[PDB]
Curated annotation (Swiss-Prot), chains A, B, C, D, E, F, G, H, I, J:
Record lineage: Eukaryota, Metazoa, Chordata, Craniata, Vertebrata
Enzyme Commission code(s) on record: 1.11.1.24
Record keywords: Antioxidant, Cytoplasm, Disulfide bond, Endoplasmic reticulum, Oxidoreductase, Peroxidase, Redox-active center, Signal
Protein name: Peroxiredoxin-4
GO molecular function, one term: molecular sequestering activity
Quaternary data: Homodimer; disulfide-linked, upon oxidation. 5 homodimers assemble to form a ring-like decamer. Can form heterodimers with PRDX1.
Family to which the UniProt record says this protein belongs: Belongs to the peroxiredoxin family. AhpC/Prx1 subfamily.
Entire-sequence positions represented here: 70 to 245 of 271
Domain Thioredoxin, first and last residues per copy: 10-168
PTM per Swiss-Prot/TrEMBL: The enzyme can be inactivated by further oxidation of the cysteine sulfenic acid (C(P)-SOH) to sulphinic acid (C(P)-SO2H) and sulphonic acid (C(P)-SO3H) instead of its condensation to a disulfide bond.
Gene this chain is encoded by: PRDX4
Source organism (scientific name): Homo sapiens
One GO BP: extracellular matrix organization
């Protein structure tokens, strides 16, 4: 139990840790699980907080390119330690007044801080997580781990490339 | 160190647990300590969440009756496990749309869950706290502990009479 | 076994600790148990001592207004660390001489200090308990915990309000 | 850490356990200590409860014959787990009504149960003590231990005989 | 194993510790158990040593008054840490030459020190026991514990009255 | 020491683990340390093995774009569990015969497996590491962690973008 | 503490365990120590009991030949677990009645069983020791250990031979 | 786990530790076990590294004289902590440029460092092994352990002589 | 495991420790056990070393008087920490040249030091045993233990006397 | 303390374990230490037993070729678990009768079995050691370990070659 060492259950080429929670999807609360994405690829990413003073360009970019992700049989889910009521309020607030507006990416609530601890992204002194990202294949196996310091974000193009690459490895062998 | 027994540091006739955090006070972020209230009485209470579908009649009632509490040398502080950004958004939201509206009672953030564990109010399976209330005298001594189940709230009149009674006991002897 | 942290078995939204003992009811010794109140609400409260120099206004007020509590399907029981013989002598002594006088509220003896430790009210250095109050619903679930400092007592009106509120929550949903 | 094995600090020919408390002496509350009896002999005895249905013949007999004990440089103290208020009420109640009446033997209160555990007389299941008696010489050394069942009491003549014998041993050598 | 605390097995109102040994009875060696006295009362007492320069007035007095004890359905047994050969020699020695002389009270040998440790009378530094006495009812329940410092002995009259009182309590209720 | 959990010393926003070793630089053995890059940015990455049947496009791409990394004050270092003699032979082998050819990127040796364990990349079952990449700032603070499953490699463009982003955050504040 | 293995402090060519006690010498009680024999040889032997039905031929033989032991600068001491009062009575009884009669060998009392445990001769189930013998030189060094079953005793001639042999070894070298 | 003491599983006249791995045999990768050599003698030896600047005299000498070992029903296997790809490249490189060239002795890979630890040859600070040699009989029993320091190597003639001696001992008794 | 206290398994009136080994009997190696002497008496003794510069008068004396020991149904065995080859060479060497010469007493070997440790005679600092002797009855029960300091040996006459005494005790009762 | 693993203190390129003892040198008893060979090379070897039926070919061969070893600044010492008296008798016995005869190689005694345990050669079940050999350089650093099974011995030519090789490595660098 040395700080954040033993807490993390995330290992590559191993079954990704199981999570369940309440997500705001299409403006309604829903129950979501990891195994709901079996037989399909999943991009699962963590961002620090809602209602901050910085534009959520990552979520907006991922949502605007969502049909490009499911054109290769992949879903995308975002997570935060906020509650589903805060997520709904963040969506329901107009983007001009510092909000999300309509979004097509499910917003998962980690109010118990447990999903964050399983994936090793929770910051004890901060009370929230860092900016992180995970790729999970059809069989629920962790294939990629990316972890950034807080200011910096993640690129949609890189995630597309990585998912296509992992799928190509799944289908064929090795490329020269 | 199981459940809420060993975690709770709150005891009556003992120095109340020390807390510090960031609060939305009069619309701006501020840094607040417990010792900022030394020499005065303090009503420190918890509520489950922001942006819920239930009217926050407790906070509104306490804030509307603030001159009665200040006239007897007492301040009032509310706490929740939400971030200061969520508190600010909840205040800035119109009350007709479900928001708090303007308030004169500081909203303290307990994003790290530590304040909740100190006072024995955090619910592990829920991710938030129950509805609890504490009275702290001029010297920072816990005088009263009140814990309700989640649905039911607290009455401003009872808090007024309790604080007046504690002050009267401080000034003089027992009454016949 | 850190002082009084681990001794208390009282948790909210959990089954209230089981207690049994000998009570002075209607001037006679009787055997009383917690489960004797199943199917009804129960106001279970503690007070420091018998035969003291202060007036027992709490017990007298609760007993004098017992039909209001019984009209909402609720019983009331008082507890102390005194023996049943002391309770009987306190009742049998005229109230003008400093006694209790006739009472309609059962007086429960906690001579072994076990009930006090279960509910986390026993004061080790004093040899008696503080002023505590507990509400238990039809199913034996703790709904409310109130702990005052020794000088200050409890209000019958607040207890009535809280019992009515919990019952209303039991019957209907949430009120706006 | 058995029920009454490790708790008892009472050993013969060893210094008697130190005790302090509040006693009803001549109708007034007083502070009493073991070392207040240094340089004199002390008969320290326990009895189960106040305000019981049985006659306190032991206390009455010891008090009525107090000049015999004082004529051989010896005091007598009685102890119980009742509070000093119960002792005062028991004395103030007329003996015809079942009370103690006026008494010349101090009544020591053990509400914290500590004195009872030091002398190994506290009964855990009952919440009070058995009938025990201890003799302590001028130097605070335990000379005699006597433990009876709850029904059976002690004799004043035997106590006087034992005190005279111990004093004679203190002065001279051995008698043939 | 703190000194002589955990060693003692003797408790009031609990089954008395079981003992067995070799006794000099009527001038012959015999095997004796505790259960040989079931259905009768038993006075079991200890004395320091044989062949000392002090007259054994206790043993002589108890033996001379044996018909008084037998007339109330009671036996008496004496014990010491000496061997049965020493007891036999002490009896066979003329009383004028410092011996015991003929006796009607069995002398039990505790050469292994185990009986002494069971009843909490053995003195580690002395190598023998103190002067102790125990009363055991028909069912083998310890009713009275008396422990004297080494110089002082016991009175036969007190033992008679104690046994009569315990028997009276067995037969009927409390006396007024 | 639960598998690879406690072994890893690599944490974000914390000083990157210290490493030292022998590197093949410009065709010669040299001693290299982490502190040799203090006051400059460093891209530290791992690759599985030398002399394999798969072309090392990652190393070749990083080396060919070295002047573009150096224009933003950044070095690049590669690590493997192979010995410096294996690295030298791999470089000293023509690329047409399945070799590295000349390279401008230092090749570090992790023959003791310590560097891999510190950065949490070593695979116990296979005896080498996965494909990992780390960004370290001027002050030796870990800024970003990337872990790919073995088949899939890393992109020079993404690393350049991330380093530019971290540097921009270092210089200015936050961008809208 | 495995039975009797760890209790014994007796080792050969090592300083013999220290003992002190009360001995009957010339018919008077005396305090005796091991170091009282320094600079002088000592034969220290253990026998089971006093006042038994078997003639003490060992003690009588050793005493009758005491001048043949002190003529080679050697003392003899006997020990038993009996008390000095029993030893005195055993001496003060004529041999025709089963006694020692006058004796010139000191009789040491081991009432605390500690000397026996140090020399590893105490029998737990018996309550006394076996028949044993030890030789100690001028410097307090154990030179010989002899241990017999209870029924069999020791020979004075063998002890004389052994003491002469050890003294001759002290004076000169090995003999051919 | 005292450094390198408990790791070693090799013991004379005991079943040799079991090993399995990948070897370069006749220019192809193969799977090899220890039990593949049952019914034959086996010379299992370690050497530090591949591609070093020193000449591999041991391997070349053993391979060039392999028919002598095979004529006495003996196999030879070499091991190192390098990967099978490094072994294949070392063989494929011409001997003029510092390679093995063609070899008839299998090259076993110990990339996991486990075989080295089982046979007690791994050097923790170096990252490789020392030069050690082991003889294993038909039944898989270790007959000899030889451990040279790093510079010094092993002789083919001595190994042949030792294998012949062990076989002769197997066939018949001791020779005069 | 305190030095040599815990090692010894030899206790009186208890079954003697089991031993097995290789003995030189009548000039030939034989396998010998303790149970080979069941149903008859055994004298088992130790001596320091073979081939020393001191004449082995003990062994010679025991062997020369062997028919006198056999006439009372008793065997004699000697033990040492030397190997059977050393024993055979010692016997096979002429007595004039510092040897044993022919002997009729079996010479047992304790090369593993186990027999010596079981009987508590082994000396850790010197690597051999002291001079000890043991008597074992028909039932394999240790009857007498003799331990001499190294210079001094044992007497055949005393052993004969002791064996005759033990046998007489076995047959009859006690002698006067 | 797992069998023979923790006992061994011998490791390559480390200071060889320190030993001291008694040796038979030129027919005389001498005291020998390991540090007596500082500044010279040392061949320290073990052999099973003395006086065995097998010819001591190893010792005789090493002794007859001692001038070759001394011409390269090297000493030779043999060790066994036998006593120095056995070594002296083995030398003094004529070689025709199964002895060493005159020898120029010191014979060291390991009667305490400690030297054997330090070098990991002692065999617990047999009570002696196997055939092992050790090379120790000028600075007392263990430089080779060789462990043959008991039937098979060591060759003088190989030891000479190894010592020459180690000395040549000491003088200059590696040879091609």
């Amino acid at each position: 139990a040395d700080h954040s060492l033993h807490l993390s259950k995330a290992k590559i080429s191993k079954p990704a840790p199981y999570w369940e929670g309440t997500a705001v999807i299409d403006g309604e609360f829903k129950e979501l699980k990891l195994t709901d994405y079996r037989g399909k690829y999943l991009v699962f990413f963590f961002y620090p907080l809602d209602f901050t003073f910085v534009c959520p360009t990552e979520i907006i970019a991922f949502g605007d390119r969502l049909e490009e992700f499911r054109s290769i049989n992949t879903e995308v889910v975002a997570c935060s330690v906020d509650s589903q009521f805060t997520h709904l309020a963040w969506i329901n607030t107009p983007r001009r007044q510092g909000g999300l507006g309509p979004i097509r990416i499910p917003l998962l609530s980690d109010l118990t801080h447990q999903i964050s601890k399983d994936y090793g992204v929770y910051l004890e002194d901060s009370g929230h997580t860092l900016r992180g990202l995970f790729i999970i294949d059809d069989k629920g196996i962790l294939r990629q781990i990316t972890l950034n310091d807080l200011p910096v974000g993640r690129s949609v193009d890189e995630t597309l490339r990585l998912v296509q690459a992992f799928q190509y490895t799944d289908k064929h062998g090795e490329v020269c």
